[PDB]
Amino acid sequence: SALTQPRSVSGSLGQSVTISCTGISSDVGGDNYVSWYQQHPGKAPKLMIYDVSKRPSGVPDRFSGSKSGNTASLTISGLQADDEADYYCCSYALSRVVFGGGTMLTVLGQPAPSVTLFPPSSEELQANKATLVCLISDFYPGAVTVAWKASPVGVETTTPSKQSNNKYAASSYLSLTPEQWKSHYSCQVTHE
Amino acid sequence: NITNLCPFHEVFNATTFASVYAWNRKRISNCVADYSVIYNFAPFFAFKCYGVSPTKLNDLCFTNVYADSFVIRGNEVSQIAPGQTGNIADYNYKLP
Amino acid sequence: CYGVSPTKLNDLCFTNVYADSFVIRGNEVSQIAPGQTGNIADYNYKLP
Amino acid sequence: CYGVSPTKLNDLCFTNVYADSFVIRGNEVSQIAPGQTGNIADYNYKLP
Amino acid sequence: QMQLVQSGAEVKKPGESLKISCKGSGYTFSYYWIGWVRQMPGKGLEWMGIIYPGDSDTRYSPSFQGQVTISADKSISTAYLHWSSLKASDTAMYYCARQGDLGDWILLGYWGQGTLVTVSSASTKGPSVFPLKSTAALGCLVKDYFPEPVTVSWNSGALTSGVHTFPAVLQSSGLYSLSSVVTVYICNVNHKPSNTKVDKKV
Amino acid sequence: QMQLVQSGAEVKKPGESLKISCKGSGYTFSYYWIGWVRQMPGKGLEWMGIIYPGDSDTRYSPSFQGQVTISADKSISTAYLHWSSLKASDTAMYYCARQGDLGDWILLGYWGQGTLVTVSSASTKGPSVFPLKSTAALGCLVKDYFPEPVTVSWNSGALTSGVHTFPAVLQSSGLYSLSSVVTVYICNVNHKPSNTKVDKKV
Amino acid sequence: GNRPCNGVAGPNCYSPLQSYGFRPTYGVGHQPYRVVVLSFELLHAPAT
Structure with a gap:
């Protein structure tokens, strides 16, 4: 059997949310062979729930769960900033540990992104290049629109970012030639 | 006319067995019992049989077969047998 | 030993003794015996 | 107890029975047992 | 532990x-x-x-x-x-x-x-480092690198506070690009996968 | 490995x-x-x-x-x-x-x-070191040693190029004698069986 | 299977000789065991 999980779930700070886990097998000796793991972006998974009726040492008591047939659930009370991460349920009844399709826990919070601009250096102009850098940060929602003014304007950007300051970031690199750069720009940012 | 392969797993391939005083019994029925796959699921220290041939087994029928699962100490393996005596044979599990 | 004693063997005679050497798995050592069945007993080596 | 039930001891027959008396610390009482290790189990009194 | x-x-x-x-x-x-x-x-x-x-x-x-x-x-x-x-x-x-x-x-x-x-099979192409109107903060640019896990430091690791590194951006030509800034300097980029270390000053 | x-x-x-x-x-x-x-x-x-x-x-x-x-x-x-x-x-x-x-x-x-x-039963007799028309090359001489595994180096191992060692010769008195040369310096003879190291300059 | 086979393997025909995955880390039951069958024929036949 293969474990199945909802790919995306939503919540809010201070509220409670539950994560479902289906497809768990059962062997002789009980059906308590269910465990959970939390994996932060860019970090290793951490054992948060094993022997669901019990909890490991050092794990916050706000995590709990229960069994109902072949379906298990993970309950979290008082969602906080550090709770925004991935969760994986695991079953180990058949002497084999399998993991679900992963879950993405999102929580609402306080949303005005910061915009900065930096012109290219002379070393790029000497190398027949001209890259205009515009950085975006300090925005809570996971969506941001990036544009450029010449008329609306290769240029690439990435939406996801790290969460060291509890906020998201963004970056875009307008790749142009020095002749086109000296022939004129302004960074255009659109956010909810 | 049954073709459902018998789930010989979940007992030999089980992660954790039950206690001695709380030995688990699993009802097995409505299947085709292929005992040849048991010899390769896990090594065997003892495969003693009573009244039934250990090899002439894949050509028989049974009303109901119950698999008792429990873990005992190494020095008391000679106690799980019909008519034997001991702590396990008296207070934990006794074979008729 | 079948029909003969493992100890009282140095005081008897035999017509011809044939030694068969083969290596089998540990769980199938009970299969090399008269009347036994199995993979080795049917397709590899069978004792009368 | 090991091998002999504490209740059936008052009725079972034995050829010879030995009694060894010694005093050890409270935190090392779990060391005197078959298969256990420690200072007493290795250098003072070892059970088979 | x-x-x-x-x-x-x-x-x-x-x-x-x-x-x-x-x-x-x-x-x-x-x-x-x-x-x-x-x-x-x-x-x-x-x-x-x-x-x-x-x-x-x-x-x-x-x-x-x-x-x-x-x-x-x-x-x-x-x-x-x-x-x-x-x-x-x-x-x-x-x-x-x-x-x-x-x-x-x-x-x-x-x-x-x-x-x-x-x-x-990209032969592990080596990166290129270039420096970046704020002054206030300064930064540098890393381009033309195929391997993603690139390490960037400032002043040979002497500046850690107020240092921020923006995520990499994949260009249309098949190469990635990142940028790191420091709150106000020499920016040191040590590309371990390609074994190329380039030092640049803003 | x-x-x-x-x-x-x-x-x-x-x-x-x-x-x-x-x-x-x-x-x-x-x-x-x-x-x-x-x-x-x-x-x-x-x-x-x-x-x-x-x-x-x-x-x-x-x-x-x-x-x-x-x-x-x-x-x-x-x-x-x-x-x-x-x-x-x-x-x-x-x-x-x-x-x-x-x-x-x-x-x-x-x-x-x-x-x-x-x-x-020789009780590990201690060796003796002595130095050796060349113009050119220099060399040294080791005599009066019973044990066979005697090693000789030049300048504590700093000179390896042009260094050559000739096999030992057993004298009539029951002792061996070897000689090592170097193409051109202190020859270092280390008698491991007796831990006796003798330094000699040509 | 019912389909004819050839010198190469197929979905319904395989090699009849399988190899033993003898490893020293296996427990009792999968380790290799050497078997020596000393066949004896004791009767009124001329003994050698």
């Missing part, structure tokens, strides 16, 4: 059969089942197999019976991973795990920091 | 019951049969016996049932050799060997570096 630090990241071409190791400490590495878990970027965990330190008994998943072999060295308490005929899709993050006294023998109690394995 | 090394060379008098050890690594030293091979100067190889480190099961050659005993330690992966009532005919070069994954259990797959054992 117990530590399960693994080896550093590696980047090889398909078919070189690299080897990954892990050094454990803080516990008796003779009786605790240790294994490895594979995870591709953006998907769930995939367990490959485990190994016992006392005797080399190995239990492999049906999907990893011959794709990877696991070995261990009880004399130095080090586990090893070995592959054969590496494919382009074999690049993934590998996490190690041990039994632990928390649950059963199969329950994974502790995890390592993870080791990234990159498999590609 | 799998490595196998033995103890250093030794020279004792008949009846001192010296001991030679062997250290292995890089593999599980519990499943591979390890043994020893004797080789007297001038003759071929003579196998003495092997031992399985997993248990106390040992096997010895019929010509070495009581002349030499073999033991091993699985906890440190170290093998040992022990003798009793040494004689003049016991001096020989001993090579260790292991089973390996090449062939059967009895086939010797890998070998060590060798350990020289000399049994005599």
Whole structure:
């Protein structure tokens, strides 16, 4: 059997949310062979729930769960900033540990992104290049629109970012030639 | 006319067995019992049989077969047998 | 030993003794015996 | 107890029975047992 | 305290059969089942197999019976991973795990920091560093690099406070680009996968 | 990488019951049969016996049932050799060997570096060093030394190019004499059996 | 299977000789065991 999980779930700070886990097998000796793991972006998974009726040492008591047939659930009370991460349920009844399709826990919070601009250096102009850098940060929602003014304007950007300051970031690199750069720009940012 | 392969797993391939005083019994029925796959699921220290041939087994029928699962100490393996005596044979599990 | 004693063997005679050497798995050592069945007993080596 | 039930001891027959008396610390009482290790189990009194 | 630090990241071409190791400490590495878990970027965990330190008994998943072999060295308490005929899709993050006294023998109690394995045929192109109206903060630009895990520092590591590194951006030509800033300087970029270290000053 | 090394060379008098050890690594030293091979100067190889480190099961050659005993330690992966009532005919070069994954259990797959054992009553006489129309090359002379494994270096090993060493010559008085030259300086003679190092300048 | 086979393997025909995966880390039951069958024929036949 293969474990199945909802790919995306939503919540809010201070509220409670539950994560479902289906497809768990059962062997002789009980059906308590269910465990959970939390994996932060860019970090290793951490054992948060094993022997669901019990909890490991050092794990916050706000995590709990229960069994109902072949379906298990993970309950979290008082969602906080550090709770925004991935969760994986695991079953180990058949002497084999399998993991679900992963879950993405999102929580609402306080949303005005910061915009900065930096012109290219002379070393790029000497190398027949001209890259205009515009950085975006300090925005809570996971969506941001990036544009450029010449008329609306290769240029690439990435939406996801790290969460060291509890906020998201963004970056875009307008790749142009020095002749086109000296022939004129302004960074255009659109956010909810 | 049954073709459902018998789930010989979940007992030999089980992660954790039950206690001695709380030995688990699993009802097995409505299947085709292929005992040849048991010899390769896990090594065997003892495969003693009573009244039934250990090899002439894949050509028989049974009303109901119950698999008792429990873990005992190494020095008391000679106690799980019909008519034997001991702590396990008296207070934990006794074979008729 | 079948029909003969493992100890009282140095005081008897035999017509011809044939030694068969083969290596089998540990769980199938009970299969090399008269009347036994199995993979080795049917397709590899069978004792009368 | 090991091998002999504490209740059936008052009725079972034995050829010879030995009694060894010694005093050890409270935190090392779990060391005197078959298969256990420690200072007493290795250098003072070892059970088979 | 117990530590399960693994080896550093590696980047090889398909078919070189690299080897990954892990050094454990803080516990008796003779009786605790240790294994490895594979995870591709953006998907769930995939367990490959485990190994016992006392005797080399190995239990492999049906999907990893011959794709990877696991070995261990009880004399130095080090586990090893070995592959054969590496494919382009074999690049993934590998996490190690041990039994632990928390649950059963199969329950994974502790995890390592993870080791990234990159498999590609881009010949590991080296990066290029260039500096960046704010002055106020200064920054530098890194471009033309295929391997993603690039390390950037400022003033040879003397400046750590107020330093921010923006995520990489993949250009349309098949190359990535990142930028790191510092709150106000020499920016040091040490590209370990390509073994190219370039120093630049704003 | 799998490595196998033995103890250093030794020279004792008949009846001192010296001991030679062997250290292995890089593999599980519990499943591979390890043994020893004797080789007297001038003759071929003579196998003495092997031992399985997993248990106390040992096997010895019929010509070495009581002349030499073999033991091993699985906890440190170290093998040992022990003798009793040494004689003049016991001096020989001993090579260790292991089973390996090449062939059967009895086939010797890998070998060590060798350990020289000399049994005599000369009490390890100390050597003597003396320096040696060239225009050019320089050299030195070593005389009055009984032990064979005498090493001579130049400038503590700083000079390797153009250095040549001629074989030793046994004088009529029962002592050997060697000479080493260098293409052009202090010649360093280190008598390991007696730990006597003499520095001489040409 | 019912389909004819050839010198190469197929979905319904395989090699009848399988190899033993003998490993020293296996427990009792999968380790290799050497078997020596000493067949004896004791009767009024001329003994050698």
